[PDB]
Amino acid sequence: DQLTEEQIAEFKEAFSLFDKDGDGTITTKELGTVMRSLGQNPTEAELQDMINEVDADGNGTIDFPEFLTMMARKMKDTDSEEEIREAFRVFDKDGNGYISAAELRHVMTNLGEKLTDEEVDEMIREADIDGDGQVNYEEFVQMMT
Amino acid sequence: DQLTEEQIAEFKEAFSLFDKDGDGTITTKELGTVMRSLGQNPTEAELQDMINEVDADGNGTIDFPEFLTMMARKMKDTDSEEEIREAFRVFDKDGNGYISAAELRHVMTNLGEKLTDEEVDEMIREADIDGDGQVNYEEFVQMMT
Numbered sequence: 446d447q448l449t450e451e452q453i454a455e456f457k458e459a460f461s462l463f464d465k466d467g468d469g470t471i472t473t474k475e476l477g478t479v480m481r482s483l484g485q486n487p488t489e490a491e492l493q494d495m496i497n498e499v500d501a502d503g504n505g506t507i508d509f510p511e512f513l514t515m516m517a518r519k520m521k522d523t524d525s526e527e528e529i530r531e532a533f534r535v536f537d538k539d540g541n542g543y544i545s546a547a548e549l550r551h552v553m554t555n556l557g558e559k560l561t562d563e564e565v566d567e568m569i570r571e572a573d574i575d576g577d578g579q580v581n582y583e584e585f586v587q588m589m590t
Numbered sequence: 591d592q593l594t595e596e597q598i599a600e601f602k603e604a605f606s607l608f609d610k611d612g613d614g615t616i617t618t619k620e621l622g623t624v625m626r627s628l629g630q631n632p633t634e635a636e637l638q639d640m641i642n643e644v645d646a647d648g649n650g651t652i653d654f655p656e657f658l659t660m661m662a663r664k665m666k667d668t669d670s671e672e673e674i675r676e677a678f679r680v681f682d683k684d685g686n687g688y689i690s691a692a693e694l695r696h697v698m699t700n701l702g703e704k705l706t707d708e709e710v711d712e713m714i715r716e717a718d719i720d721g722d723g724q725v726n727y728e729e730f731v732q733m734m735t
Binding site: 459462463478479481482483484525526528529530531532533534535536537538542543544545546547548549550551552553554555556557558559560562565566569572574577578579580581582583585586589590 | 604607608623624626627628629670671673674675676677678679680681682683687688689690691692693694695696697698699700701702703704705707710711714717719722723724725726727728730731734735
């Protein structure tokens with residue numbers, strides 16, 4: 446949590462990864478995807494105070510630069526804990542604070558070993574993502590096979 | 591896959607990993623977990639057929655040995671594809687063939703890095719898993735923090 450070549454360089458990727466359009470323009474919606482995609486849990490309001498924040502043209506689009514500036518500021522409210530607790534929260538479907546010790550084990554080793562961060566990113570790229578960040582999990586299977 | 595030492599050793603782990611009773615016997619339920627814990631997607635019937643075959647006393651129990659023998663048989667019946675697909679299915683909450691490109695990325699890298707395959711088992715070992723394998727993720731959160 447401190448703007449640095451790497452930090453930034455990374456922040457680009459995530460931004461590039463969810464700009465379906467293909468031209469540096471993350472939508473209010475694409476914005477959330479980006480953040481969750483980094484461990485943050487932006488509230489629908491929070492994502493709003495962010496669009497209006499800078500963008501005063503109501504274009505609803507966000508330029509990497511703006512994004513970067515935002516992140517930098519909101520970076521203070523990011524500690525290892527929340528990030529972690531979000532990962533595990535993906536495995537909590539019904540949302541009961543409870544998760545499959547199993548599903549965990551499986552996803553983490555089986556799929557955690559067959560793939561490398563870079564590979565995860567490469568897939569998501571060619572992958573067919575929509576606004577929300579949804580993707581037909583089969584697409585991934587076809588790739589991985 | 592075949593019954594190589596490593597393989598046996600792996601099954602042992604998983605089996606040991608969900609025999610909450612502390613001894614060397616897993617229940618029909620526990621069985622389910624163990625299997626999901628390895629990418630197998632056991633059907634209730636299948637699970638019952640197993641508890642039935644061996645253990646004619648229908649004790650509902652099953653030894654590592656019996657377990658080993660069993661897995662051996664169903665072994666050549668499962669292929670890498672299925673496991674892959676089951677992994678991804680964890681990420682598909684409402685079960686609509688769709689998952690969060692984000693959540694994937696997040697879980698896969700953030701938490702995919704903070705832990706090593708063993709660190710996972712080691713955690714689930716000390717973790718407070720219940721019958722269905724359910725676990726309070728917070729408990730994992732703490733261990734991590």
